[PDB]
């Protein structure tokens, strides 16, 4: 149960990346670029 | 990792894993 | 931890704070020590760099963790106050060529 007021006033955003099994995790890089 | 260390068995969905191409040759010989 | 990826695919989550500029990463439910601080008015594109060792490489996920807005709210103005995650047709994967 998230706080609706906190959700409305917040500016944090989230996304996730799922690396499938069998793919080398060292070869995969996740983050942001400009 | 080894140092780090009714049942529901959940094995690795290993089908997605792929081998190096030499490894394909090695798998071929050991299958033969 | 190791071998926490073969039973289930690895979960790296990216958290961006547009008010403070703090970039924190959540991986498999534990917060990674790596963090980045950016300067105001910075356009950050979600991005993944990978070398394919399998037919399936990775998967963008647009969900939300507790007390965080989904990426669609930050991206699209009309969805600013919509907690429900969305993937409008405008959003699409691009590659460097």
DSSP string, A2-31: --HHHHHH--EEEEEEEEPTTS-GGG-EEE
Gap between the Cα atoms of C53 and B7, Å rounded: 32
Q: How far is C80 from chain A (nearest CA, A)?
A: 9
Q: Which residues of chain B does A22 touch, with a Cβ-Cβ cutoff of 8 Å?
A: 13-18
The number of residues making up chain C comes to 97
For B4, the closest of C1, C7, C56 (CB atoms) is: C1
Per DSSP bridges, beta strands A29-33 and A12-19 are unpaired
Mutation choice for A interface testing from C5, C22, C75 by most A CBs within 10 A: C5
End-to-end CA distance of chain C: 35
Cα torsion angle, B11, B12, B18, B20, sign: negative
- Cβ atoms of A18 and C9 within 8 Å: the answer is yes
Q: Do B13 and A23 touch (CB under 8 A)?
A: no
| Tokens representing residue C70 in the block | 């989904």
Resolution of this model in Å is 3.1
Q: Name the closest residue on chain C to residue A16, using Cα atoms.
A: C13
SS (H, E, C) chain C: CCCCCCCCCEEEEEEEECCCCEEEEEECCEEEEEEEECCCCCCCEEEEECCCCCCCCCEEECCCCCCCEEHHHHHCCCCCCCCCCCCCCCCCCCCCC
Q: Name the closest residue on chain B to residue C3, using Cα atoms.
A: B1
Cα torsion angle, C94, A13, A16, C41, sign: positive
Q: Which residues of chain C does B17 touch, with a Cβ-Cβ cutoff of 8 Å?
A: 54
Residue with tokens 């140092």: B3
| Tokens representing residue A4 in the block | 């609706």
The number of C-alpha atoms within 13 Å of C71 and in the hemisphere containing its C-beta is 19
Q: How far is B23 from chain C (nearest CA, A)?
A: 13
The DSSP secondary-structure symbol of B3 reads: T
For C54, the closest of B1, B4, B17 (CB atoms) is: B17
Per DSSP bridges, beta strands C22-27 and C10-17 are antiparallel
How was this structure determined? It was done by cryo-EM
Q: Which residues of chain C does A2 touch, with a Cβ-Cβ cutoff of 8 Å?
A: 66-67, 83
Q: At B2, give phi and psi (nearest 5°).
A: -60, -40
- Cβ atoms of C58 and A7 within 8 Å: the answer is no
């Amino acid at each position: 149960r998230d706080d609706y007021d906190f959700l409305m006033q917040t500016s944090t955003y989230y996304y996730s990346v799922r690396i499938f099994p069998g793919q080398e995790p060292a070869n995969v890089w996740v983050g942001w670029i400009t | 990792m080894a140092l780090y260390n009714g049942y529901s068995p959940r094995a690795i969905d290993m089908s997605n894993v792929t081998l190096s191409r030499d490894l394909h040759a090695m798998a071929e010989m050991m299958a033969e | 931890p190791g071998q926490g990826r073969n039973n289930n695919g690895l979960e790296i989550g990216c958290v961006v704070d547009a008010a403070s500029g703090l970039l924190t990463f959540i991986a498999n439910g534990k917060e990674l020590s790596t963090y980045y601080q950016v300067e105001p008015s910075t356009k950050l594109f979600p991005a993944v760099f990978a070398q394919a060792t399998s037919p399936n490489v990775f998967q963008f996920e647009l969900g939300r963790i507790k007390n965080v807005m989904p990426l669609s709210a930050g991206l699209f103005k009309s969805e600013h106050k919509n907690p429900v995650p969305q993937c409008p047709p405008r959003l699409h994967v691009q590659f460097l060529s």
